[PDB]
Design a binder for this molecule. Structure first.
Ligand code: NA
Ligand code: NA
Ligand code: NA
Length: 640
């Protein structure tokens, strides 16, 4: 028994060394090279595992049903089942055999070639054939390509057919002028250490028509990932990059010669889009005759993925932001279909996937507006647009009388002196303010007073009916919305600030469109939906239907009233219920305060669409409302 337990331990140490990819340590646990002992020395056992397991990308060795018994007084036999992962999938239930040598107080393994794979003898060989899987496509709600595989025209220069002095310098300036290239970039490209004078040095992927080709400039045709919307959907779709040795070490089933999603939906749906590698892993004898097929299956191309996105609305929403910082989310609020998820500024996903220079990537990374941010998935304070929610909560618990008229003097208000120098600020000095007037003029003082009168307890009861703290079932990385940092405000100022969408509220644009959908579903919250085939989810009785029938007519006046904050949208001549908003943010880079401009809008007649747009750190005289006319026209025409 004491020798049987020692034999079991050494087999477990041998498997563990192979499991951890430490082949040299596993070889040192073997007996000496002999006839009935080990078949090879330690160095060539190391080389056999390193060569064979490396060729099949063997990762992770797990065994089961280990049995060590006694044959002779010096040799103990062992057997166990085992499984491992390869570049062609999991290789399950492998029956391994062998014997253990016992001399002195050391138990070693009589190594044989059948310890690499179960049925190998002597000079048997291992072969691996693989067929690469074609990557699936990402399409919109009408089948338009968002991420597809196309034929790209690659511009390149052959430094041999270029020149020497006057001919070389003139041709480089001609190519740089005819293809929007820097003369220093072309010289740096052909001066790389890998370049030979007769080689084809690729420069960039050209899109559209091809101009004249000067001496040396030649166009070759290559296949690669292509994004038709470009930067208009770069944060949502993402990009693919070359698979690295580090990627294979983490997942050997990846194609060692293919692409992998690095961000966005390309990464979130990488498994479904990449498919499975097809091929065969077989064992042959010394004559190359097939002895045993270990793994074999055909190639399975990646499956397509259809989104709720409207490719026309996505491009319209992104273009409307004019390159400024901000985001826009468009939905069909009755089903939750995400028609558009625009984030601005953005980056070029085609440039990312077709090789980007360290300078262009550095410009993206050091842009203070940060184009890499997915602003539709980043939490923000919702701004004074949130007065809709506080009003609906106040109507439900009876704390807000729609006809009660408050008397507000000036633009600043304080509960008492305990607030110190802080005051809630409004933009319009209206003396007699009821609920309808407060929504039309966006009166933060009114709602701050109604929030304080309502109380934190009743306020949170209405807030808890929404989606605060919930994880949305979406293939987009995001954090749950929050009311504040803790379960209690512990501050009348924080309570009042939360009443009009400031405070410690953090809600991303997608979560905002979810909460605001109650006004298009008579108080029912409809969860947003990105995958077209998925089922509509909703949440009943978030706010009362009476509150909806009270607030939506007021939201019509935000557009139709001459002093409504969204009156410029009345020029469209379409039925609109809207609510503008602002959020004041303090920053340390600039001692002056920044603000975000918000716009909520939907069709109150048919509930066909709904949009939530925001400008982050807006320039002076800029707003989300002045940029929404084109998207509102398109959504109203095509979504009823
Ligand atoms: Na967050
Ligand atoms: Na707090
Ligand atoms: Na406003």
């Amino acid at each position: 028994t004491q020798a049987v337990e020692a034999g079991e331990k050494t087999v477990e140490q041998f498997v563990q060394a192979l499991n951890k990819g430490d082949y040299n340590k596993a070889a040192e646990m073997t007996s000496k090279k002999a006839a009935n002992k080990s078949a090879l020395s330690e160095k060539e056992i190391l080389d056999k595992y390193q060569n064979i397991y490396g060729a099949a990308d063997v990762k992770g060795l797990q065994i089961s049903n280990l049995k060590v018994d006694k044959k002779d007084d010096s040799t103990y036999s062992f057997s166990y089942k085992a499984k491992m992962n390869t570049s062609l999938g999991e290789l399950k239930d492998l029956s391994y055999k062998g014997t253990l040598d016992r001399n002195d107080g050391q138990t070693t393994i009589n190594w044989q070639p059948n310890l690499v794979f179960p049925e190998m003898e002597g000079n048997d060989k291992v072969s691996l054939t693989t067929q690469e899987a074609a990557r699936g496509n990402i399409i919109d709600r009408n089948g338009e390509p968002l991420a597809t595989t196309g034929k790209l025209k690659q511009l390149g220069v052959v430094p041999s057919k270029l020149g020497d002095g006057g001919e070389k310098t003139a041709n480089i300036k001609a190519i740089a002028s005819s293809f929007d290239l820097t003369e220093d970039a072309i010289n740096q490209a052909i001066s790389q250490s890998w370049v030979q004078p007769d080689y084809f040095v690729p420069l960039k992927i050209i899109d559209g028509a091809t101009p004249e080709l000067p001496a040396g400039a030649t166009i070759q045709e290559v296949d690669g990932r292509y994004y038709p919307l470009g930067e208009a959907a770069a944060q949502l779709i993402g990009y693919v990059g070359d698979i690295t040795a580090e990627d294979i070490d983490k997942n050997p089933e990846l194609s060692s010669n293919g692409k992998i999603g690095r961000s966005g939906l390309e990464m979130a749906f990488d498994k479904d889009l990449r498919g499975t590698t097809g091929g065969k892993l077989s064992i042959t004898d010394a004559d190359g005759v097939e002895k045993k097929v270990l793994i074999e299956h055909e190639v399975q191309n990646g499956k397509d993925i259809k989104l709720t996105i409207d490719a026309k609305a996505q491009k319209t929403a992104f273009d409307s932001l004019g390159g400024k910082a901000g985001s826009t989310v468009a939905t069909t609020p009755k089903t939750g279909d995400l028609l558009a998820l625009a984030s601005s500024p953005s980056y070029d996903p085609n440039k990312m996937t077709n090789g980007i220079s360290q300078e262009d990537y550095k410009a993206y990374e050091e842009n203070p507006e940060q184009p890499f941010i997915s602003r539709f998935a980043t939490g923000y304070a919702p701004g004074s647009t949130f007065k809709m929610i506080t009003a609906a909560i106040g109507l439900d618990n009876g704390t807000i009388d729609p006809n009660e008229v408050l008397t507000i003097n000036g633009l600043k208000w304080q509960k008492d002196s305990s607030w110190g120098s802080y005051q809630v600020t409004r933009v319009s000095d209206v003396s007699q303010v009821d609920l309808k007037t407060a929504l039309i003029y966006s009166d933060n003082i009114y709602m701050a007073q109604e929030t304080l009168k309502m109380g934190e307890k009743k306020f949170r009861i209405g807030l808890d009916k929404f989606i605060f703290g919930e994880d949305l079932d979406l293939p987009i990385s995001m954090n749950p919305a929050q009311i504040s940092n803790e379960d209690s405000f512990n501050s009348d100022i924080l309570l009042a600030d939360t009443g009009y969408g400031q405070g410690e509220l953090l809600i991303n644009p997608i979560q905002q469109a979810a909460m605001y959908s109650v006004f298009a579903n008579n108080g029912t919250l409809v969860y947003p939906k990105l995958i077209a085939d998925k089922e509509t989810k909703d949440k009943k009785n978030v706010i009362g239907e009476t509150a909806v029938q009270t607030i939506v007519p007021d939201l019509r006046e935000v557009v139709q009233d001459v002093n409504g904050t969204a009156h410029s949208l009345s020029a469209l001549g379409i039925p609109l219920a809207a609510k503008t908003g602002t959020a004041e943010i303090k920053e340390k880079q600039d001692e002056k305060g920044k603000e975000n401009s918000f716009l909520f809008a939907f069709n109150p007649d048919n509930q066909g669409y709904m949009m939530v747009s925001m400008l982050e750190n807006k320039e002076d005289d800029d707003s989300a409302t002045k940029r929404a006319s084109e998207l509102l026209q398109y959504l109203n025409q095509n979504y009823q």
